[PDB]
Amino acid sequence: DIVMTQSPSSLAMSVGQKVTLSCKSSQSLLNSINQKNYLAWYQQKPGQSPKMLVYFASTRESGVPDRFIGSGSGTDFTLTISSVQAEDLADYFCQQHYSTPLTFGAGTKLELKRADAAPTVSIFPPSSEQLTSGGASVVCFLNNFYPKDINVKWKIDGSERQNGVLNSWTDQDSKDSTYSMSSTLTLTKDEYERHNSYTCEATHKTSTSPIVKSFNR
Amino acid sequence: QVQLQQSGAELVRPGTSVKMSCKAAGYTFTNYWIGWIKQRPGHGLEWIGDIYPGGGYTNYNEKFKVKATLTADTSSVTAYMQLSSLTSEDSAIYYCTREGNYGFAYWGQGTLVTVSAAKTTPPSVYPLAPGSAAQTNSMVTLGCLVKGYFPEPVTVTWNSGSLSSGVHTFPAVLQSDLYTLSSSVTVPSSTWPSETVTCNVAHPASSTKVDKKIVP
Amino acid sequence: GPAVIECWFVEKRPGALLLEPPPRPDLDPELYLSVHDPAGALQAAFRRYPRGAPAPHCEMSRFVPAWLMVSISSPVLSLSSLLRPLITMATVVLTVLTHTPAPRVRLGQDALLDLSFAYMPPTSEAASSLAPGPPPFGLEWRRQHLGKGHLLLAAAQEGAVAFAAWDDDEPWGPWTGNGTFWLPRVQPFQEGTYLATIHLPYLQGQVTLELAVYKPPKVSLMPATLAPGEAPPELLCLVSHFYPSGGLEVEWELRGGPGGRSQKAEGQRWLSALRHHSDGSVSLSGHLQPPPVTTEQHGARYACRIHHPSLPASGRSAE
Ligand SMILES: *[C@@H]1O[C@H](CO)[C@@H](O)[C@H](O)[C@H]1NC(C)=O
């Protein structure tokens, strides 16, 4: 019934400064009697259970610092963090507690702001023991790049296909606050011996020209 | 204080049923609502339904009326949720919470449910060398690709864990009803191939351990 | 390969380090030391010293866990040693040595600071040691500014990886070990003094390095205009993408004139055009006002010579 639209998708701001999160509802969540907005903000640490921060669109939960300020009314609600720190890196959700069924928001992911860094692309040919038992799988790595916006594209000496292309993105590092990415080209030994060039391209904001690493069979 | 302990992970087959537990210790269990939340990767949070262990028992969601029946035990403090007709889209993390007037604010530990019909197989690991024809500048990147294993937990350690800096392990990806991941490590060219580099992969489900060196 | 090393004992008094009995002359007997190194690291570093190289700076202090701490610094090596006692006999205990004390890495490239260490326990230590073998060590890498400041690596933003090992594991005699530091994508804000500290349950040793960053400039020459009709002198010489702001001196020369191929140009010339690019590097535009070309200067060509610490001794030329 009630739709909870969270904005934006995922912002990455540096620590210290104030960040803001918006939440829009499909209908009014403000009760006429006992004038409170039945809406709650939840925070979930990476790989853990969510904990409530603000309920009734205001009045923070006990144990939560005063930097988390919840405001808004009607259909538009806002959660502001005056001084972001390392203990605030998580994802937040806005949930309506007014009508059934209870609905949550899409969730805004909080990352750490950094300078742009080009990915470290390195391609790898299939192993010898893999060919004798199974097929052939090409491996391409993209290590330590900012931001997380990245796209990979393969090419087989002119041809190109998305079949057998399984990627894997990592979360933000807990040390250098960078992102990594891997990509595999799972094939068989049969159709691998009939092609020569195998390249792994990318598309990042740092360089206008893609990073191309290829090798001949 | 109040606390909610849930059952362990449930790895089952499609089409079957699953019942999980949720013990509530620290308050009057028959005096508050117990809600169930589903968190599936890529779909956020979803409310399944609440149950009051007293008079007015259950109240289900529109899309969770046939699936996920709710029962409670007033004798021994426990809340149950009986899942039925498990499909591949039912793989998520299920939390039990103590609902209130303004929300939950009291969550459980969580129960991971995974559904598939693949048997328990050992992993197949393969080293990943840059090859002889390469331009190794300063640092050389090595890999340890592990394909063709099921469950989920697998630990990977370089040189028995002595070399953990600059190591990037990627999350598992299911492929042909078998998962697959890879691990990367950056070492200087003055060390490799001057010194041996070995990846040790341990699978606690099949109880296996494989130590493979990276050779050119 | 010097056999004796002059040094200053601070608390400064003159002293000597000897790697058969030299006649002790104008030296106090407490600072005339016959050195014996079971680890063989300091003596090997002194033997591998370049021939004819200047005398390295040396300092000697009193350490408190006798204990003499020797810091030998040079633009070739950096060494820190702990000693243990008419010539006083001394035995080397711990040594931290690096043969890359002044590494110059290009901007944007990865830096690899190398370090080695050697440990020789005293007789009183090994006799009261029930240890299984080599002790567990720690290796800290920090950035220094007249004291201490930011610890970067250990066993940490922007990467900075540290590795350290022995790969000997022989429960007997002195131990040798390697230690490396990797700094990815060196930015101009990361240049300066670095400090490597080896901390053993026995004690601490420290060595100092100076990581400097350079960037070769791009030189180009072309005629100048002013959009006119007539011709007021005006020449140009563009310098692009350089980081060392100091040591830059623009010079002009006429090659192939009626008086050799090394004659500096005459006339007006000015330099003030510089721009800060979006990467920290800078650019420059040189200008020349040559006299009217005579018939005797036919076939010659003007050129602007550029000198910078990021360039060889001959610099770069563009005609
Ligand atoms: C230390 O590095 C040198 C080369 O710089 C190498 O020959 C030696 O084997 C290394 N020692 C260890 C213990 O790895």
Author numbering:
A (entry chain L): 1 to 217
B (entry chain H): 1 to 216
C (entry chain D): 1 to 11, 20 to 27, 33 to 78, 102 to 121, 131 to 200, 211 to 282, 286 to 377
Source paper text:
To obtain additional mechanistic insight into the contribution of tapasin structure to function, we solved complexes of tapasin bound to Fab fragments of two well-characterized anti-tapasin monoclonal antibodies, PaSta144 and PaSta220. Consistent with prior immunoprecipitation data, PaSta1 and PaSta2 clearly bind to distinct sites on tapasin when evaluated with purified proteins by SPR. Both antibodies bind tapasin with KD of 1 to 2 nM. By contrast, PaSta2 contacts tapasin in the palm of the glove where MHC-I binds, interacting with both the N–IgV and the IgC domains at the tapasin hinge that joins the N–IgV domain to IgC. Although PaSta1 interacts with tapasin largely through the CDR3 of its H chain, PaSta2 predominantly exploits its L chain CDR1 for the interaction. Comparison of these five structural models highlights the flexibility of the IgC relative to the N—IgV domain as tapasin interacts with different partners. We compare the various models based on superposition of the N–IgV domains to visualize the potential for movement of the IgC domain, which is displaced by as much as 14.7 Å (for tapasin–B:44:05), 8.9 Å (for tapasin–PaSta1) and 10.9 Å (for tapasin–PaSta2).
